[PDB]
Structures are given as C-alpha cells and as structure tokens.
DNA sequence: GTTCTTAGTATATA
DNA sequence: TATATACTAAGAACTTCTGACTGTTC
C-alpha cells in the first residue's frame, strides 16, 4: 500500500493573537506540524510529504499569478519525510500579517497531487489543511474541488481552533461551510472529520504505534485421514522487537565498513590459532566426556516431518487444560481460507460444538520443515463478526516442571488474623481499578492496557528524536505523559490513600 | 535442601553363586536382570541430573579392591559423576559371555557379610567431597535371610544398619526374584523405609526417561510494593520453560579438544584493534544517521526500580484467554527479605480467592528493561488424588499484552452453519474424546536428539529411533469414528477439493 | 576401522572418506610396508579409488579383482 | 475505528 | 570470584 | 518477511579470616 501526505498550514496574521490562557493556533497547530512529522518520520512507512504553508507574506508556488493562486509558499513537494526538513519547519516558519484563501491553497495541492502522485505509483492521497477559518473565501471551485478530490481520490480534513462540543461570524460561517464540503464529500458522518486543536494534541501525542503485518500461512487442516480442510493461520499477538536495530559503528569516523566482528578460534596450548570454518566439529556434552557429533550427522540423523502437519490429536475438556500452562511464544488465530466457503461453514460447525460442548482440540503444530514441531490447545472464540479458533504452544512433558512449594493453609506461623482480612477486603474492593459501568457490566476498565503503547518503543523513538533533533546533548528524562501513561488512572490513587493506610498498621514490615 | 547439594545413589549387587547363574527358567537372569536396571537407570541419569553421582560395587566376590582392602568386595566404579567411560564398563558384563567375563575376572561369588557390605558402602558416601543433598542405596540380592547360620554376623549388620539410618544415609532393595524366598519381613523389615517374588519397584527403574529437572530455585526475588510504602517480598519461579537441547561446544576437529572461542573486532582502514570504549552505536532515519553511547544504547531502557507495582484488580472474565504472550511464571513470597510480608502476601491470596478478582501489576525483572503488564490471577491448591501437590498456590503471571503486539486481522466475513451439520458434529466431536494430561506427550526433537546422544556416546549398532505419541495413530480416527466424513461430505462439499 | 558404527555408516554416507578393513594395515605393518590397497582390504570408498580398478584409470566394479590364489 | 489521520 | 542461568541479540532461508 | 540457531551478554547462586580445640606440656 502507499499514501500520499501533504500538510497546508497557515501563516497568517490572526494566528499571531489569541487568548493568553490558551497557546495561540499558530503554535499550537505548529506542535501538531511538528510531531506529525515526527510521526512519519520514525516509522518507515513509504508515505511521502508534502508542505504547504500558505497565507504568506510573499508567494513562492508553481503557480503564482497576480490573484489567482496568491500567497502561498509551497515548503517542499511530495517526497519523503525527513529531518532537516523538521528543523526547518521548526525555525524558518515566521509570523505573518496578511489574510489569505484556503480554497487557494487546496488547489494548488490538488495541482501538485495531479502532478506527480502519476509520475510516481501511488495508492490512494490525504489533504490536510490547518486554518483558524478567518479567510475571505469564494465558493465558486467547491463542487469541482469536490469532484476532482472524488476522482483524484484525495480525503479533506479540516482542523479549526474552535470546539463543537467564542469565535468571529467570519469564523461561525467558515465552519458552516466546511460542514457542507464535508458533507459534500463524504455525507453526514463529515462530523467527524471536523477537528479541533486541542484534541489533535491528544489523539497525536503517542508515538506512532508499530504497525505489524502478518503473513498468509494457509495449511491442511487435518482431522483424521480423510477430513483435510484448507485452514489459513493468522496471528492475535507476538512480543514485538525493534526492526531497526543497533549498527555498531567507530568512533570519530562514524563509517560502518570501518569494523569487521570477526571471530578466531584458537587452542589453549600455547595459543595455536585454528583455520576458522573447517577444523572445528560441534561436540555434545553427555555427562564427563564430549561427543564428537558434527553436522553433517546431524542433519542425517536429525528428526524429520511430512511437513505442515497441522492434525488434531483429540479433543478434551477446557478444565483438562487451564491457563497456566500454556508454553506459546506466539498465539496463531486460526481462520478458513478465503473463497471456499463450504470449508468456512464446515470450520464454523467445529467452533460452534466445540464451544457449546466446552470441548477444545490438541492439535500438532508444524510452521513448516526442518522445524521443531508442535503440540498444544486449538481453542474456539466467538465474536459477532467471525468465529475465531486460535492456536497456542503447549508443554511436553520434558518442558513441565515441578516443585513442592510447602503450601499456606497450614498458616500456624502467619496467621490472616480478621482485622487483616476485612482490612484486605477494603482494599480490593476500594483499589478496583475496573468497577462497573452502563448497567452492561462493562466494568470501570479506563486501563485496558490492550490499547496502550509499548513505553519501550515510546522511549526509543523519543532517544532518537531527542539526539536527532540537537546536536550532541545529554538524554533528556521520561515524558511526563508516557509516566501519566503508564501509571494508572489518577481516580483508582486518590481512592487508594484510606485503605493502604489501614493496611500500614496491621503488620510488621521489617527492613 | 541445599541446591548444591546433589544425589548420590550407590549401586550393590548380590555376587555370589546364589543368582549369577539362578536362570530357573532360559527367559531372563537375575543377574542380567540387576545390570540390565542398573544400566537402564544410570544412562537416563546421564541426561537427567548430570549433576549427580553414581557408584556401582559388588560384594561377595572372590577377587577383591575397596579403600580399605577388605574381603569379597569389589567396588566396580567409584562415586563420581556419570560418564559414558562407565556405561561401557557395565555394558561389558551385559551377556553370556559377558557373565563368563565377570566370573572369571572378580570370581564365582565366596562367602560375604552384609554387615561389611554396608561398612563400604558408608567409606564410599564418606569419600566424595561435593555436599549431597539426598543418598541412596540400593541393594541386588535375593537371599531374602542373608546368613540364617551366624547370628553374630547378623546382630551386627542390624548395628550397622540402622548407624547408616542415623548417619543420614538411606537404604532401598527390590526384591528381584526367587523360588520361594520372596518375602522381606525375614531380616529386613528393620532395615529398609505385603510381597511377592518381584518388586514392582524395581519395574519403573526401566522406564527409561530422558528428562531433565532443576530443583527448588528462584528466577528472580523482587519486592511487590502495594504502594510506595507497603512492601513484600516475593520470588518469581518459573513453571514452564520450554526447554532447549544442551547447547553444543566447538571441538577441534580432530585432538577433541576445547576450542575456547576468541571473537574479537577490530580496524578495517588500519590493522588496530578496537576496544569496548572504541566503538559507537548507531541507526539511519530520515536519510540522517544517529550516534549513542554503548552505554547509552541500555540507558535508553531505564524505566523504574526492579520490582512489582501493584496498581487495582481486575474481574478474572476481563482477564482473556485470547492474548496470551509469554509464558507464564508463579508467585510465592519468600520469607527472608520482608520478614513477615508472607503474612500479607496469604491475605491477599485468599481474599482475592474469595472476591474473584485479579490483580494487576507491573512486572520490571531486572535492571534495564521496559516494564510490562502482568496479573497475580490468585491460584489454589489442590491435592485431592494423593494428598500431593499439584497446582500450588499462589499467584500466576499472566503477561498482558502491549498495544503494539494486537497484529490487526485481515478481516473476513462470517457463514453460520446449519443446526444439522452441528448436531452431527456433537457426536463427531464426542467420539474423538480423549483425556489430556500434563505430561502426556514428548518432544520428538528433543528425545530424538537425546536418543542419538547416547547412540553416537555407546557406539551401538544402530540408534534407538524412539516413535513419540506426537504422531497421530491415524488407524484409530478412521476407525472409531467410523465413515462420517463422507457423511460430512454430502452435507457440506461440493465436487471441488 | 575394526568394527562399524552408524559414524562409519555416516562416513559411508559421507563418501569423501574412504573406509579401511583394519587387517591389511597389520599386513603392511607385518610388511614392515606400506601394502597398496586392494579392495579385498576395505569396505567402502570414493569413485577416484575405483576408476584405480585396473591398477589404473580403467572401471567401476567387481567379480574381477583377483590374483591368482585360493 | 479511527483510520487515516488517526492511524 | 565462579558458574550458572537467562535473553536477546544476532543471523540466515523462501 | 518470516523462524531457528548462535552468540554473547548479563545476573544470580555458588567462596572470601576468625574462633575455638586439643592436644602438649609443665
């Protein structure tokens, strides 16, 4: 996929003043600017940038003219996002003291948009405008504005200082007509591409999230010998590491090719180097001594597998596995695959039974050969859109483990008196972060922790801006907000203070 | 116990002409029975506990060695650790000619005193120097009244013997086989911790495992704070590993020797040799490249102080079964940091048992790593088969996912299916029942590798090829579910594959 | 080698060895010389070894390689 | 859910 | 201080 | 763009002189 970006900020006159409560849509829209950039910058997504800063106080566009396509200075075209072009955008932008259409500037990105998102292959185009709606605007193009975005396939957004949930008729009238482009675009759900500033700082202040595509595995799902179903496995969730990682490069060069890792292999009697990819043959260790396997034994030797391999053993009980057991490194979902859809119907017959009967499938597991393979839970969801079968690693026996773990109920020596107990009741009661909410017992999860960022990937990108962004300077401390983001919602602390103090002195806490 | 203490288990069999060659029937020998055990236990040993130690010594025997030059006692292999130097020592007995070898080497079996028997067995436990945490010893014999003629010498061997019960040494027989003669009240019942003429006992000591255990151990002790105040000390164990094969150590091709790998990096404009402080991490964004300190590249990690933040509780239905991430690991406190927080950490646990709640953390291992988001989903105890432990109670650590781990599904449309087709699929899925236990299966990898270990360590004629349940037994599901896949088939399948 | 393993089955699996019967060294030793070897001394071997067969650079097989004897 | 601008 | 135990960080194949 | 193996990198669970004893002697 590939995306078209081009930013339209003004640099008018009206931005330059506002309430002194209130940081002024100039440099707060400029925030936003700024850490948008930011944003497709880190990630590597292939979007190309474009800038037009219009309102200017002189006029540098392709398509100057007298009055037609006037003060605008379009800041770099549709390339891609980097950083000197930040810093720019973070110095050279100025104030300004005229008054200029938007109209204007939306065409000319149009213009550029028809100019060059065909001399390059693209997908599909985003304008944005930011404005405070203080323009003298016509509204002659807006039906071919409208149906040149239509056919150009360019999605309009506008981003206004005011709320719609204290501005000029110049701006009430503005915002009157944006509702109707909009809407002329779209339909009534135009609503929502109406946004304010201050909530553009709340959706925009994450980091951009990493983004993760998975990979179309279609497999035989096998039941039996003569029960073969396509099945196509996708994935619900993997521990994400960082996909640009360290380079190591030499000091006061800063060129990569400069060190080689090389490794040498040597022999403990005086230092005698060894030739470094052929006299060295891999040993095991089986008690005292060292067998000398190698590789070629290896792979003669080595366990082989039809292949795919994904067979049910049977199916059981959901108590005959429970929770704590479950060995994956990663969780598969396991969903038909597309245009058969009698195999669909009969996957579903599957997860419906298995469902209703509680009954969950053990199944092994093969990503493919030469791999390890596999054995654990096939278990069935169910959401309103789709069914949902999802697959994850379970132990061999080699891999349980056992412990005695002297148990607790035989608490002569700790003893739970009941001021400690009912004090503790106080606690996981008063403490509940989730409490319930709408009478639907959706309950009080303003931490979900499903939908909340990575801090480390927050903080990487940060490091990376921060050192970008200057010079060398030291390292900056972690980001109130990411700490805000971290810690739980400040209502479930203020609850906390009575009953962690009610705990503090009912028992013994030595050092 | 002490983790660096380690089992010991020393081997002793009956040499005398009593069983070297009882052979009653032409099936099975007893002595070919004791060293085929032996053997059978001390190669799973091998890959089990490495760590351990094992010694095999006979008594009776008419050629003699022992640490103190005593009679009729033959102490084979020493206490040490297991290596396959001694699986072959005992492989040469294994057979008719390899008993022809042991009697005419150590002797056909003269006179004997168990009394001086377990005397050297105690030398042998007193010797090694490496602390152990359990010692064992097993006995090979079937003359179930070991000398009905002197009671002297059998007045002392019960001194002897409970000495050993006291000195802090156990002792174990499994009563092989006899004509008669197969009972353990005469003489014994004093000695070891009704009957019959073979011991089951001895039975699973061919069970032949290659498993692996490490005992009673902490991951890591950190301090759960319920605030910033309240602090208890907890030790996060791990019940789940997934364990690797060993991993393997580079050979010189040809001495076998270590080759003590020397990785190193260094110049390429000039011959130099680059150090630690030398060099510089770096990426590439925005067509403009980056610059840290080593020592930066893990100060970027720095999020809070080792240990657990316990923040609310959570109702144990939103805690999902759909997003599972990283294995799962237990919580115990350990009661030598905080004294007396094991007090609060019970509380806690039965309450929460009680409210059917969770609770919510977060979970920083060590030193420089991003904190994530865990659950103490409370865990109780059940014994109910045999009055042992089987789920221990505590907390779970159910890891909760991270925002950027979700891995949007390329969304498809749903078909529900006809209440025929479920209905019938009800039975399907009945008769394809079977009960799954723990440690019902095997890696086939792992055991596989094991298996060729000792394949390539024993110089056999060709390895064990063990076949693992991993496999299905593909005759059984056509067969006990008979032909409702063609039943399947007319209901929902179209001529197309 | 005096007697097989599967690492003798491996290093005849891996032909690039070629794998010697232990009593024609003994011969050689017994020759106080090194005997140049005649497949009747071996039991496994890489082709270079075989297009040897004439003595010389010549076949592949055998129910040929004799000398006259008993 | 939120597309485009948002993601 | 020694050894260990992770991890995780890296690389390589279709 | 996957997953698999290797590696190496680190952390933790394993030592750290002093006290007491018995002789030996008178």
Redesign the interface.
Same mark, same amino acid.
Request: hydrophobic residues 40%; aromatic residues 10%.
């Given at each position: 996929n590939k995306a078209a970006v081009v930013l339209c900020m003004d640099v008018g006159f009206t931005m330059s003043n506002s309430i002194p409560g209130i940081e002024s849509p100039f440099e707060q829209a400029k925030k936003v600017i700024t850490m948008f950039v930011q944003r497709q910058?880190?990630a590597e997504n292939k979007d190309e940038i474009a800038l037009v800063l219009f309102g200017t106080d002189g006029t540098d566009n392709p398509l100057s003219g007298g009055d037609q396509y006037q003060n605008i200075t379009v800041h770099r075209h549709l390339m891609?996002?980097?950083?000197?072009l930040?810093e720019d955008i973070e110095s050279k932008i100025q104030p300004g003291s005229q008054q200029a259409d938007f109209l204007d500037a939306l065409i000319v990105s149009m213009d550029v948009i028809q100019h060059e998102t065909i001399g390059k292959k693209f997908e599909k185009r985003?304008i944005?405008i930011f404005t405070d709606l203080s323009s003298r605007f016509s509204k002659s193009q807006l039906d071919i504005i409208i149906h040149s975005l239509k056919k150009c396939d360019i999605?309009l957004?506008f981003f206004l200082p005011f709320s719609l949930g204290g501005i000029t008729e110049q701006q009430k009238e503005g915002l009157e007509i944006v509702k109707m482009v909009m809407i002329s675009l779209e339909g009534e759900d135009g609503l929502d591409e109406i946004?304010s500033f201050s909530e553009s700082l709340r959706?925009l202040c994450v980091f951009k999230?990493?983004?993760?595509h998975?990979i179309?595995w279609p497999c035989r799902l096998t039941?039996?010998?003569?029960?073969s179903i396509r099945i196509a496995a996708?994935?619900?969730?993997?521990?994400?590491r960082v996909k640009?990682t360290?380079?190591? $490069?030499?000091?006061k060069?800063?060129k990569? =090719? @400069?060190?080689?890792?090389?490794?040498?292999?040597? +022999?403990?009697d005086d230092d005698e180097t060894?030739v470094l990819k052929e006299?060295?043959?891999?040993?095991?260790?089986?008690?005292?001594?060292?067998?000398?396997?190698?590789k070629?034994?290896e792979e003669?030797?080595?366990?082989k597998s039809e292949g795919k391999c994904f067979?049910?053993?049977?199916?059981?009980k959901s108590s005959?596995?429970q929770?704590?057991?479950?060995?994956?490194?990663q969780?598969l979902?396991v969903?038909?695959a597309?245009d058969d859809?009698?195999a669909?119907?009969?996957l579903?017959?599957?997860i419906?039974?298995?469902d209703?009967?509680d009954?969950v499938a053990?199944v092994?597991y093969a990503y493919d050969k030469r791999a390890?393979?596999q054995?654990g839970v096939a278990?069935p969801?169910i959401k309103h859109?789709?069914?949902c079968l $999802?697959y994850?690693?379970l132990?061999?026996? =080699? @891999?349980?483990?056992?412990?005695?773990?002297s148990? +607790?109920?035989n608490?002569k020596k700790?003893?739970?008196t009941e001021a400690?107990?009912n004090?503790?009741?106080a606690?996981?009661?008063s403490?509940?972060?989730?409490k319930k909410d709408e009478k639907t017992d959706t309950?009080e999860?303003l931490?979900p922790?499903?939908?909340?960022?990575?801090?480390?990937?927050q903080?990487?990108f940060q490091?990376?801006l921060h050192?970008?962004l200057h010079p060398?300077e030291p390292?900056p401390p972690?980001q109130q907000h990411i700490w805000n983001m971290?810690?739980?919602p400040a209502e479930?602390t203020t609850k906390?203070q009575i009953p962690?103090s009610k705990?503090?002195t009912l028992?013994?806490?030595?050092? | 116990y002490k983790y660096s203490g380690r089992d010991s288990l020393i081997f002793l069999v009956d040499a005398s002409k009593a069983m070297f060659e009882s052979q009653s029937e032409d099936e099975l020998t007893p002595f070919d029975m004791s060293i085929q055990c032996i053997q059978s236990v001390y190669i799973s040993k091998?890959?089990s506990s490495?760590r351990d130690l094992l010694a095999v010594v006979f008594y009776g025997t008419e050629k003699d060695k022992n640490s103190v030059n005593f009679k009729n006692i033959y102490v084979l292999q020493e206490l040490?650790?297991?290596?396959?130097?001694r699986i072959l020592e005992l492989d040469q007995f294994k057979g008719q000619q390899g008993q022809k070898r042991f009697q005419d080497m150590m002797g056909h079996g003269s006179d004997y005193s168990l009394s001086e028997v377990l005397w050297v067995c105690a030398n042998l436990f007193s010797d090694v120097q490496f602390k152990m945490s359990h010692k064992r010893i097993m006995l090979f014999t079937n003359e179930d009244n070991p000398h009905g003629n002197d009671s002297a010498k059998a007045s002392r061997a019960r001194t002897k013997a409970g000495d050993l019960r006291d000195t802090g040494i156990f002792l174990d027989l499994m009563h092989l086989k006899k004509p008669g003669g197969f009972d353990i009240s005469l003489f014994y019942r004093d000695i070891i911790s009704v009957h019959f003429e073979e011991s089951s006992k001895l039975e699973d000591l061919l069970r032949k495992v290659?498993?692996?255990?490490?005992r009673?151990r902490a991951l890591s002790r950190l301090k759960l704070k319920?605030?910033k105040?309240?602090?208890i000390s907890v030790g996060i164990?791990?019940?789940?590993?997934?364990?690797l094969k060993?991993p393997?150590?580079?050979?010189?091709?040809?001495?076998?020797?270590?080759?003590?790998?020397?990785?190193?990096?260094?110049?390429?404009?000039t011959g130099g040799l680059?150090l630690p402080s030398?060099?510089?991490?770096?990426?590439?964004?925005?067509?403009?490249?980056?610059?840290?300190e080593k020592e930066?590249?893990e100060?970027?990690?720095r999020?809070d102080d080792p240990g657990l933040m316990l923040?609310?509780?959570?109702?144990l239905v939103?805690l999902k079964?759909?997003?599972?991430?990283?294995?799962?690991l237990?919580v115990?406190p350990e009661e030598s940091l905080?004294?007396?927080?094991?007090?609060?950490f019970?509380?806690?646990?039965?309450?929460?048992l009680?409210?059917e709640?969770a609770?919510?953390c977060?979970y920083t291992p060590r030193r420089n790593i991003?904190?994530y988001?865990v659950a103490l989903?409370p865990?109780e105890?059940e014994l109910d088969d045999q009055k042992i432990?089987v789920?221990?109670?505590?907390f779970?650590l159910?890891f909760?996912?991270?925002?950027?781990?979700?891995?949007?599904?390329?969304?498809?449309?749903?078909?529900?299916?006809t209440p025929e087709?479920?209905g019938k699929?009800?039975a399907?899925?009945?008769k394809?029942?079977?009960?799954?236990r723990?440690?019902?299966?095997?890696?086939?990898?792992?055991?596989?590798?094991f298996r060729?270990?000792?394949?390539?360590?024993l110089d056999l004629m060709e390895?064990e090829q063990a076949v693992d349940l991993?496999?299905?037994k593909?005759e059984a599901?056509?067969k006990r579910?008979g032909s409702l896949?063609?039943e399947?088939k007319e209901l929902?399948?179209?001529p197309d594959y | 080698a005096g007697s097989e393993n599967?690492?003798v089955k491996?290093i005849i699996?891996?032909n690039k060895h070629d794998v010697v019967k232990p009593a024609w060294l003994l011969e050689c030793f017994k020759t106080k010389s090194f005997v140049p070897w005649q497949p009747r001394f071996m039991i496994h071997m890489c082709p270079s070894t075989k297009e040897h067969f004439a003595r010389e650079y010549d076949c592949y097989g055998d129910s040929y390689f004799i000398d006259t004897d008993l | 859910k939120?597309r485009?601008?948002?993601?």
């Open positions: 910058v880190f891609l996002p980097d950083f000197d930040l985003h944005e999605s957004q946004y959706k999230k990493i983004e993760r998975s179309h039941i039996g010998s003569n029960l996708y994935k619900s969730i993997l521990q994400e640009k360290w380079t190591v $490069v030499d000091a060069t800063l990569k =090719e @400069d060190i080689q890792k090389e490794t040498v292999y040597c +022999l403990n060894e006299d060295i043959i891999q040993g095991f260790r089986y008690g005292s001594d060292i067998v000398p396997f190698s070629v034994d003669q030797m080595k366990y067979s049910v053993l049977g199916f059981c005959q596995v929770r704590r057991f479950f060995m994956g490194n969780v979902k969903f038909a597309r859809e009698a669909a119907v009969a579903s017959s599957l419906h039974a298995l209703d009967l009954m053990i092994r390890n393979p054995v278990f969801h859109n789709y069914e $999802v994850v690693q132990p061999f026996m =080699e @891999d349980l483990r056992q412990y005695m773990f148990s +607790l109920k608490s700790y003893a739970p400690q107990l004090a503790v009741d606690l996981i009661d403490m509940s972060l989730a309950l999860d931490f922790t499903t939908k909340i960022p990575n801090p480390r990937f903080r990487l490091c990376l050192r970008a060398r390292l972690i971290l810690n739980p479930v906390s962690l705990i503090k028992f013994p806490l030595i050092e | 091998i890959i490495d040490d650790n297991p290596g396959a130097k290659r498993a692996k255990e490490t009673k319920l605030n105040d309240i602090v164990y791990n019940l789940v590993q997934k364990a060993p393997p150590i580079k050979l010189y091709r040809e001495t076998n020797e270590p080759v003590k790998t020397k990785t190193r990096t260094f110049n390429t404009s680059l030398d060099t510089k991490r770096s990426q590439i964004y925005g067509s403009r490249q980056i610059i840290l930066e590249t100060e970027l990690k999020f923040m609310g509780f959570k109702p939103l079964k759909h997003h599972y991430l990283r294995p799962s237990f115990y905080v004294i007396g927080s094991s007090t609060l019970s509380a806690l646990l039965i309450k929460c009680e409210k709640v609770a919510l977060r991003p904190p988001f989903v865990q105890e432990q789920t221990p109670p505590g779970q159910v909760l996912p991270f925002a950027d781990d979700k891995r949007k599904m390329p969304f498809t449309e749903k078909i529900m299916a087709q479920v699929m009800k399907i899925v009945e394809l029942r079977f009960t799954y723990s440690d019902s299966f095997e890696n086939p990898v792992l055991q596989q590798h060729n270990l000792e394949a390539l360590a390895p991993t496999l299905p593909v599901m056509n579910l896949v063609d399947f929902v399948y179209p | 599967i690492r491996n699996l891996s | 939120p485009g601008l948002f993601s």
